[model samples]
Target chain A: KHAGTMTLEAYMRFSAKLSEAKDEMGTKEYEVFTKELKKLTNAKLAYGDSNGNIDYDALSSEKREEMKKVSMGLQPYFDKLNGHKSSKEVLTQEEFDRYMEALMTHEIVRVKTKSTGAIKVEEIPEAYKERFIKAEQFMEYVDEKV
Target chain B: KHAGTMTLEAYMRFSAKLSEAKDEMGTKEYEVFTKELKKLTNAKLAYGDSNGNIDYDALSSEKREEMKKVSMGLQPYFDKLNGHKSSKEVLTQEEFDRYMEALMTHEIVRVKTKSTGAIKVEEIPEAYKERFIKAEQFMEYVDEKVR
Candidate 1:
């Protein structure tokens, strides 16, 4: 069974509000221009992670290991660039976990062999995968957006 | 004396919720970052005009006139570079008004020759000044930590 569901409604609500806020408060052409610019930039960055298709069995063990390394490597850089001193300070623990899970899933998809192309229950070590799955569930809940 | 009173709490709540929504699903950080960044940037620009007391009066009327003409003339080029399709959309009516008000204020501050140097009319523009003030107050009210 799928761990969680992601929906376009949740994502779109966020986008629409952001657009309205920019339209209302933006005080100049430059301001609105920047607003649209940011919108497009974010859309591209988040394209892969927001949908409901969390295909675990599609990736092999080697791919999962590679995914793990890439995701782990990204944590520090994302923090540094965003000046996120701690994930907890910038994001709720749940939010952070969900973010990590998306990263792991991305890795899982990238390197699986044809026959063993799925994240087996035992393949993801508990320490890392626990946070990953928790994060995954959070995204699904978030995707459901109230 | 201001037109309206906007509680900062309302503004922050609105902005915060706005930011959160974008971060979660906007497809990109650009959209979320820019929405808030516009306000932050505009506020910084306004600070020099209203809060910092940067006197525009030191310059002569002729200089001010020249500058306005120059600004108006160059606006089209900026519009073109920024991909503005038409004149009206190039400058949203509301934003244009704010920019004009700021420009006029700069001129007024420059020309005023009253005996007293300070001009503190009891009335303020509630939407422009008070809204921002309230927004700040609201952050304190909520004890928001944005580190």
Candidate 2:
């Protein structure tokens, strides 16, 4: 069961909403929203907030609908946000999808855990290696420390 | 040269302090603090707030000193938090230190980027594999996304 991939799609949509709504959400509300986002993406880490149990479902159909709307609604927001104009060359959508798929493959490998009786990682499928390398490299942006 | 290691230490202290101070910091202040923390830990992703430059300086000596004080002050807070005493066993500091060292090595390897003309990843080193694997695994927590 690729329960792992379920939240991945939701997180993309929800995160878009979060970024668009950033100025509006209050501290307490943002905190709650963040906790939900985390659980929706990955349930394991969502624990330790002293909230004993997390539904541990990274994304629900209801949230899926909620996130989808904002992701769609935020089109102009993204345009203004990133390189709206032609500052840099953009990756083509087809190419972007290929790499995203590679990243997803690596993710499928990465999400399995030993302590959970998974024992070890699954080999990242053959064609994914080169793209996975770069996909992983981009991830270095967040992994600066333990 | 080891600019790579600088923010690693600050992130720990600041995170500890942030956790303790969680309730007190207002939204704007916390947002500002978080932006700083991200820059402190890793500068590349902190952009797009439309704020042109992140001092992108993950930690200044000033921040280091500030974070240190809270880190020390928060000891009792940590005690009451994680295990408080016994439910789950805690790792010994010495063991934790060794694994942290292995992680730092992997970090040194991971942080170098090809776009910076770094070419490719450096070998993770001989002995660091097992420890690095586990360290990488635990980090899966935060890496849930580009967060």
Candidate 3:
């Protein structure tokens, strides 16, 4: 019952929920950055249709040019963050600067989406809640596996 | 040149060979007992025709009866050893008294199996050599698993 459906979009939706639940759920910082990129790709796929199923990848020339604004805006922030940062613990000053920008962008998006009757924040599963709490300790077991 | 195909029984046969080698190697009583037991099991498996497989859970009725006779036959030797006790560290009376009966049984099996010539004494593997020495240190690790 809990594992409803696993899809690329489903994963992106999960990633978006994690940004809200991150601190309370105790998710590791490195995992958050990796998941965030793939999610933006999914968001681009779901943008601008009444049912949010438009494909940015196969858009017409005019539509592609229009989508470029959205693509370029988000791409620079991620590229700046991903290129500059190595590990979560050893984050660069550029990453810290971009992180504040992303956080502000997220808050504004949340308010606008809520105002315009967009999708509600998905409920995080109980399994995610439980694991997120001990994610740090689980990391040691990861080291042992390799 | 003798390093060949190894199976579970072959491994035991390997150990039995190790015991004979130790007789030519080490010189301590307790070490001999431990080393010998290691070899005996291996030899039994190695010479065993069922591809070195051992039926540890099965009891042989004839062998059981033979073992009884062997135990009874060794009683007099034990009694005689007790009759004249020594305090020397080489073969202390305490050690003699503690192991005399066990030694008799061990010797009986050792001699009985020696006639079969099923396996050869080989060098103990480095992995098992470390395990043999470090066995005591791992009691806590085992206790956690079992208890």
Candidate 4:
């Protein structure tokens, strides 16, 4: 149901929803924000590559210039997160699973892209297949839990 | 008197000395071991260049082949450390100072090379100048603290 670069409209909606939902969600607030921040950084890094592999040499000068701007904008947020914690604490097996599921859920939606000139949705890129599978499992788990 | 590559004999001596000192170093065991491991990885990554500006694409086939061997040999050590901890925890201000000093000490000795036929030792590479400066300040701090 999604594809390519997330539209500005879609990004706005997602950001608003996330802001609303974040406080009610039981996880650490900084952790949630940091995760989203990392996504933006990753998106900036992966600007030219839809599949998430970045090749700096392959990037156009224009795109690279835009990336520099994107990076500077995120610097304060990055510093905020970095100041909060220097290192991650250990997680138990169950906690680790839950964290991974949350990460998968975050990406599985935005990373999907619609096929051009066709009704079909293109498969999520291979780089994301593992996350996609975990996301599927997470939804199933959520269904059982709820 | 340092050079591009440590002689095989010198490498063996350094490796053995590091192993011995590592266990004895009270607060810096993990930090020291990690530094030596990084040096090996950096050496592997920087096969053709001693000046530390490595251009892998510019390397000859022979050097590339050697890098592969070096990489393979270091893989098990990298795996061991990676398995131990993915990220380092914050140290105390004092501990952080010591850690930085130790890091600088490790690099300073290795980075110094005798200029060809000259008696003077060259300065550390620009990449490591900040650390070198910090290390110098750290020794002065230590001098005051101990005395």
Query: Best candidate per DockQ, number?
Result: 1
True contacts kept of 1: 0.00
Sort by DockQ, best first: 1, 2, 4, 3
**lDDT (10s digit) by residue, model 3, range A53-87:** 23343557786555444433443333333233222
The ten-residue window of minimal lDDT in model 4 chain A covers A1-10
B53 Cα displacement, candidate 2 (Å): 20
Mark the regions of model 1 whose C-alpha exceeds 4 Å error after superposition: A1-146, B1-102, B106-147
Error of 1 at A131 (Å): 14
Per-residue CA lDDT of candidate 2, range B57-136, in tens? 24476854454344323332333333233111243555434433343333433432212122232344445446556666
Model 4 clashing residue pairs (backbone)? A3-A113, A3-A114
Give a tens-digit lDDT track for model 3, residues B69-130.
Answer: 44334333222223322222224455334333343332233233332232222333343334
In model 4, where do residues sit more than 4 Å from their true spots?
A1-146, B1-7, B22-135, B143-147
For each candidate, give its TM-score against the true structure.
0.21, 0.23, 0.17, 0.21
Per-model lDDT: 0.38, 0.35, 0.33, 0.38
Ten contiguous residues minimizing lDDT sum, candidate 3 chain B: B1-10
| lDDT for each residue of candidate 1 in A81-121, tens digit (9 for 90 to 100) | 23334343455666665666674453444222111234554
The CAPRI classification for model 1 reads as incorrect
Off by over 4 Å in 2: A1-58, A61-90, A114-146, B1-75, B80-147
For model 4, state the Cα shift of residue A28 in Å. 50
Candidate 2: CAPRI quality band = incorrect
> Per-residue lDDT of A1-146 in model 2, one digit per residue for the tens?
22112212222222233444345456675455444443322322222121111221244768544543433233223333332421112434554344333433444434322121222324544554555566666434222311
